[PDB]
């Protein structure tokens, strides 16, 4: 399910990168940090 | 028909529209509108 939602945002960022917007490393770096934060708290509660 | 001619004549001179046009043209001479300038204004 986690692989499904990351494949959804993978095809979403492919749709972003087809449309050629500015500042994609900054924005998808922030969002990769956000998914890393959410996966950290999910792994924390899962190890609990 | 004396009274109809009198009252419709009074209503006819009430229905002259010259003063509205002359006050309108007076207002646009008092405005004196110019187009020209920088086409953005801040």
């Amino acid at each position: 399910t986690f692989s499904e939602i990351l494949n959804r945002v993978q095809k979403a960022v492919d749709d972003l990168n087809l449309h050629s917007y500015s500042n994609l490393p900054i924005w998808v770096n922030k969002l990769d940090m956000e998914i890393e934060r959410i996966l950290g708290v999910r792994l924390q509660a899962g190890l609990r | 028909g004396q009274k109809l001619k009198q009252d419709g004549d009074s209503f006819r001179m009430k229905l002259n529209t010259q003063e509205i046009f002359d006050d309108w043209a007076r207002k646009v001479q008092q405005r004196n509108l110019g187009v020209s300038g920088r086409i953005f204004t801040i």
């Binding site: 500015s22 500042n23 490393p25 | 920088r38 953005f40 801040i42």
Partner: peptide
């Protein structure tokens, strides 16, 4: 020699661009 990351090209805010064009009009 990594991907040395580019500087973030920022959209200018409408107030700072309007004070910039206010300075541009005030210099005109």
């Amino acid at each position: 020699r990594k991907l040395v990351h580019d500087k973030e090209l920022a959209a200018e805010d409408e107030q700072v661009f309007l004070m910039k064009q206010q300075s541009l009009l005030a210099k005109q």
